[PDB]
Scaffold this active site. Structure first.
Site, PDB file in Angstrom:
ATOM      1  N   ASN A 267      -7.222   9.647  -5.838  1.00  0.00           N
ATOM      2  CA  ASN A 267      -8.047   8.785  -6.664  1.00  0.00           C
ATOM      3  C   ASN A 267      -8.856   9.578  -7.662  1.00  0.00           C
ATOM      4  O   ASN A 267      -8.955  10.799  -7.551  1.00  0.00           O
ATOM      5  CB  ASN A 267      -8.958   7.951  -5.769  1.00  0.00           C
ATOM      6  CG  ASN A 267      -8.169   7.049  -4.839  1.00  0.00           C
ATOM      7  OD1 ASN A 267      -7.409   6.197  -5.295  1.00  0.00           O
ATOM      8  ND2 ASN A 267      -8.321   7.244  -3.539  1.00  0.00           N
TER       9      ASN A 267
ATOM     10  N   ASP B 294     -15.511  -3.537   9.486  1.00  0.00           N
ATOM     11  CA  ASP B 294     -16.618  -3.052   8.671  1.00  0.00           C
ATOM     12  C   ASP B 294     -17.460  -4.086   7.918  1.00  0.00           C
ATOM     13  O   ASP B 294     -18.457  -3.728   7.281  1.00  0.00           O
ATOM     14  CB  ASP B 294     -16.092  -2.010   7.689  1.00  0.00           C
ATOM     15  CG  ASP B 294     -17.169  -1.073   7.208  1.00  0.00           C
ATOM     16  OD1 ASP B 294     -17.721  -0.333   8.056  1.00  0.00           O
ATOM     17  OD2 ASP B 294     -17.463  -1.077   5.987  1.00  0.00           O
TER      18      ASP B 294
ATOM     19  N   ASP C 123      -5.858   8.784  -0.574  1.00  0.00           N
ATOM     20  CA  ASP C 123      -5.492   7.733   0.374  1.00  0.00           C
ATOM     21  C   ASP C 123      -4.289   8.225   1.182  1.00  0.00           C
ATOM     22  O   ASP C 123      -3.337   8.779   0.618  1.00  0.00           O
ATOM     23  CB  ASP C 123      -5.133   6.458  -0.364  1.00  0.00           C
ATOM     24  CG  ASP C 123      -6.288   5.909  -1.162  1.00  0.00           C
ATOM     25  OD1 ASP C 123      -7.452   6.138  -0.791  1.00  0.00           O
ATOM     26  OD2 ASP C 123      -6.030   5.242  -2.173  1.00  0.00           O
TER      27      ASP C 123
ATOM     28  N   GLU D  73       0.825  -1.200   0.000  1.00  0.00           N
ATOM     29  CA  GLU D  73       0.000   0.000   0.000  1.00  0.00           C
ATOM     30  C   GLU D  73       0.862   1.254   0.000  1.00  0.00           C
ATOM     31  O   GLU D  73       0.629   2.176  -0.791  1.00  0.00           O
ATOM     32  CB  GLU D  73      -0.935   0.049   1.218  1.00  0.00           C
ATOM     33  CG  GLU D  73      -2.183  -0.835   1.153  1.00  0.00           C
ATOM     34  CD  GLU D  73      -3.149  -0.479   0.020  1.00  0.00           C
ATOM     35  OE1 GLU D  73      -2.998   0.595  -0.593  1.00  0.00           O
ATOM     36  OE2 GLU D  73      -4.060  -1.283  -0.272  1.00  0.00           O
TER      37      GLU D  73
ATOM     38  N   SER E 143     -11.103  11.663  -3.994  1.00  0.00           N
ATOM     39  CA  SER E 143     -10.690  11.385  -2.629  1.00  0.00           C
ATOM     40  C   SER E 143      -9.185  11.097  -2.662  1.00  0.00           C
ATOM     41  O   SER E 143      -8.600  10.965  -3.743  1.00  0.00           O
ATOM     42  CB  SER E 143     -11.458  10.190  -2.072  1.00  0.00           C
ATOM     43  OG  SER E 143     -11.157   9.018  -2.813  1.00  0.00           O
TER      44      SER E 143
END
Length: 129
Positions: A46, A101, A52, A35, A50
């Site tokens: 992105n 989640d 990251d 990542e 948004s």
């Protein structure tokens, strides 16, 4: 800060990630590798606008507020900048909510595509834990 493989494994373990929700430590170190390449300061924008943030590339649309993502939900209640700190506590606490989640670690595309169903034990091999 750019973590070393074993150094990160130890900080993540100390923070209660080893086997959190069934995912062994190797899964978390493998995910961080792909990542962010173990860099706490990594950011990536992105197409949806948004961004990251950090070691685990946590998204600004749902988890943190960066002030520039319309409709962000800020579920971890923290500014995204807190996720770039050399201290991984905020990233770890937020990752715990994300993995709980309902989708588990599939929330991380790099985990799904590069760690899932691989010998993740190799990522902590040789470390003093």
């Amino acid at each position: 800060k750019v973590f070393g493989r074993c150094e990160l494994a130890a900080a993540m373990k100390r923070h209660g990630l080893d086997n959190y929700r069934g995912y062994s430590l190797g899964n978390w170190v493998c995910a961080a590798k792909f990542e962010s390449n173990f860099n706490t300061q990594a950011t990536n924008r992105n197409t949806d606008g948004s961004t990251d943030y950090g070691i685990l590339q946590i998204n600004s649309r749902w988890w943190c507020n960066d002030g520039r993502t319309p409709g962000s939900r800020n579920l971890c209640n923290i500014p995204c900048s807190a996720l770039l700190s050399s201290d991984i506590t905020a990233s770890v606490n937020c990752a715990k909510k994300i993995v709980s989640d309902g989708n588990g670690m599939n929330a991380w595309v790099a985990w799904r595509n590069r760690c899932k169903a691989t010998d993740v034990q190799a990522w902590i091999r040789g470390c003093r834990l």
